[PDB]
Design an enzyme around this catalytic site. Structure first.
Site, PDB file in Angstrom:
ATOM      1  N   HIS A  81       8.222   1.127   3.552  1.00 53.58           N
ATOM      2  CA  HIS A  81       7.778  -0.073   4.147  1.00 53.58           C
ATOM      3  C   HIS A  81       9.076  -0.914   4.505  1.00 53.58           C
ATOM      4  CE1 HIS A  81       3.575  -0.347   3.464  1.00 53.58           C
ATOM      5  NE2 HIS A  81       3.867   0.321   1.952  1.00 53.58           N
ATOM      6  N   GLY A  82       9.050  -1.997   5.271  1.00 53.14           N
ATOM      7  CA  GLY A  82      10.281  -2.714   5.694  1.00 53.14           C
ATOM      8  C   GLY A  82      10.178  -3.969   6.542  1.00 53.14           C
ATOM      9  N   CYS A  98       8.898  -0.633   9.136  1.00 54.08           N
ATOM     10  CA  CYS A  98       8.659  -1.740  10.309  1.00 54.08           C
ATOM     11  C   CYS A  98       9.923  -2.831  10.200  1.00 54.08           C
ATOM     12  CB  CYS A  98       7.219  -2.611   9.714  1.00 54.08           C
ATOM     13  SG  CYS A  98       5.765  -1.688   9.749  1.00 54.08           S
ATOM     14  N   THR A 144       0.846  -1.194   0.119  1.00 51.88           N
ATOM     15  CA  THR A 144      -0.077  -0.160   0.082  1.00 51.88           C
ATOM     16  C   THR A 144       0.650   1.176  -0.063  1.00 51.88           C
ATOM     17  OG1 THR A 144      -0.359   0.247   2.486  1.00 51.88           O
ATOM     18  CG2 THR A 144      -1.539  -1.142   1.343  1.00 51.88           C
ATOM     19  N   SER A 145       0.091   2.256  -0.311  1.00 48.74           N
ATOM     20  CA  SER A 145       0.709   3.640  -0.290  1.00 48.74           C
ATOM     21  C   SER A 145       1.045   4.075   1.282  1.00 48.74           C
ATOM     22  CB  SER A 145       0.060   4.704  -1.152  1.00 48.74           C
ATOM     23  OG  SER A 145       0.190   4.369  -2.598  1.00 48.74           O
TER      24      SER A 145
END
Lengths: 4, 240, 240, 240, 240, 4, 4, 4
Positions: free
Chosen positions: E93-94, E135, E34-35
């Site tokens: 993100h991560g 994350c 997701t954005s």
């Protein structure tokens, strides 16, 4: 300016 | 308990303490002393500044020599057991070692002796701060282009000017010293130790102020405050 | 470059500066002044202490009033451009505002005026420290059981005792004040700002010393040093 | 009362707290793990160091995986209400996220979860320090020539080495990390905040140590410790 | 010269250094990611914050895994001789040890290895700061009601969350961590050492934020950032 | 020197 | 509030 | 102890  | 150190005064008593501000503006004509225009700005600035530091501020205006002594005497006889410190600000005319009541001079030593460690037991071991905006002489600074303790211990004399020198007051903005002191207290009381705050005051007065007069004798003069410390510990206005 | 602040004196000049130590022990009989037993211990302690702080120490012994003035005059005329500060220690008899040469008194103001910001340009804006072990009167403390700058700016007077009071010296261990000063400098010169070090000295003198005399008038007396600061910045003996 | 600030943990509880030191030197032959020569020097150094900081030190030697868990479980169930903090030092073989019991590996998370803010209420809001001397992998550093809170909050993991790297131990002087940690604690525990002390430890390990081996693969290697902080306040071992 | 100490990084080079901000908001549909609504607020906040600290800020948006690597590679090959430090902020993100490019994951180690002491000589001995908002897993914190150096040395990883945990981002105000980081930097960059500023960030995130969701699984969750330091000296953004 |  |  |  003045003195005390 | 873990390791403890005692380098700073205990300032977490129930009350920070009293802040007595004596503001002498009008003097008895017979004394031949002029009114101190701008001193009310100083008195209000100090009241607000120390109120923010949680001090019980008491402002007194135009007190005679006799009234100053009795006030100091009575204050020293109060029970300061629950107070962390004591502050007294004197705004008036003066000379070396002297502050002026509305009807005559008062020896500074007479005022401070009431708070000696052996004469005010509820303040023994606690910082006693005397802040003095008054002349200490007539010299002008031309500047240059860039288990027992001593009864005199725990006193701090924050003089607006160097020994033997005039002290400057602006009839519109207030005294150079008091203006600077309040500004530095407002900005660093939560951050720096008192001697460091006063050093900032010295720098502010020394660099940002210069007199302007049509009288060459009093024109372009400078001022440097004088910190006279007999304190035995670091003083922070905050705690915890 | 990133954000910069200027709260402390620049102490990274090529040299820390000179440390002049005037040690007067023997006085001309006609002055009616006693010898100052124990002062040599003070002089050696100070020499070593300031040597460790990287100061160029110059010790002078038994100087007449005339010699003190000429020494100060000559020192003030030296080029201090490459020096960070200036220190002068006076060990002698004295009274308020006076230091004694071997043949007579010398006004402290006369000595310090040579270093005024407008009279010693190579020291303008640099800390000028005067350390004074001498009486400032005859009072005894009985204690109690527990772009221009001012020419007077950047001076620091570290007096061994409170205004108007006697100063104590032990013929065996040296003066209370100098003993304490050197000890605190040795321990905190790398850790604390100078005013805080001096505050530690105040506490040491005030709590660890008490006179012992067979003369009731001089027995069980205390002492509190007096820090008189006209400095405009924080002073740290270390840098980088 | 005057202005108060809450930037540092309250460390003036009746007791500093417990310091659990788990020293695993001998391992069950079946594990195929070598003995950790020099670890006793580390254990004694830590015992003395934390004893000086006023911690209740408990040393445990050669504990199995099962014993480590039960010890941690029991300790977490003690009443720490009167304690300022908690410290646990682990000396053993290990890998990333794992510490070795004498008979097998133990997940570090299993050990620390017992002290989570929601699982050890008497330690909630208090610093929980885990000091770990053990490998976190097999990488070698060749060097280069020069009102609710999170349950994971208030934990501090002082790892002897960087994530994924071997940790060095000298069979004669003890581990590089523990040697340095104790030295820095002895010298700055009264002066600096814990993160700054640990930073000094990083510098000491990084600059003063380099491996020597006849095996080219393990020769001339370096190490950098890793401070992993989830603390929410400054930590000073002293108070008042 | 006087006594010198070397406890803090030299931050008075001609330039503070580069601040690379990688802001990934839009991801390739095929990644199924997701954005990241609100990330632009973070990017602008960081740009302004580091601009005020005198860093040369370079913002990059929506970079692929390949572009991230090439950017880092090229930056590490620049001449940083005249720069005091290096900062890189990653917003994406991560998961544990991974940051996401718009088209796929990138190992954090691959990004940081370019700046190792032996691979970027112009940054050797200088602080390399990686600030990571992403994350590190899927765990949720339920909270509880109240002469050679190592090649890995001089790195500082300021993670928005604890190892293995999700990191929270508000689509309107920006991420909890970045919001807090910028606020604390704006207020204490001139006053406190970097580790102490980060500790304040930990406290801010831990106490002032709590998730709100209609999904019970993600409702009322907390977060604690994680400071991972391999620094060898104190870091102050100001000098002189 | 040995490893852990 | 959302996760990254 | 003596005085100065």
């Amino acid at each position: 300016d003045e003195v005390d | 308990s873990g390791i403890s150190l005692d380098n700073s005064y205990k300032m977490d008593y129930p009350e920070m303490g009293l802040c007595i501000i004596i503001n002498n503006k009008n003097f008895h004509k017979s004394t031949g002393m002029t009114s101190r225009s701008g001193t009310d700005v100083d008195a209000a600035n100090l009241r607000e500044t120390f109120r923010n530091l949680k001090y019980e501020v008491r402002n007194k205006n135009d007190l005679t020599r006799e009234e100053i002594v009795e006030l100091m005497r009575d204050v020293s006889k109060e029970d300061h057991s629950k107070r962390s410190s004591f502050v007294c600000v004197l705004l008036s005319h003066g000379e070396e070692g002297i502050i002026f009541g509305t009807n005559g001079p008062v020896d500074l030593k007479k005022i401070t002796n009431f708070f000696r460690g052996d004469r005010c037991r509820s303040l023994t071991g606690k910082p006693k701060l005397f802040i003095i905006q008054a002349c200490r002489g007539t010299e002008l600074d031309c500047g240059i282009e860039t288990h027992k303790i001593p009864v005199e211990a725990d006193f701090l004399y924050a003089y607006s000017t160097a020994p033997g020198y005039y002290s400057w007051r602006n009839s519109k903005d207030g005294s150079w010293f008091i203006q600077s002191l309040c500004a530095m207290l407002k900005q660093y009381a939560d951050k720096l130790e008192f001697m460091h705050i006063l050093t900032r005051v010295n720098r502010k007065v020394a660099t940002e102020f210069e007199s302007f007069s049509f009288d060459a004798t009093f024109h372009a003069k400078k001022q440097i405050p004088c910190i006279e410390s007999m304190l035995t510990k670091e003083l922070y206005f905050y705690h915890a």
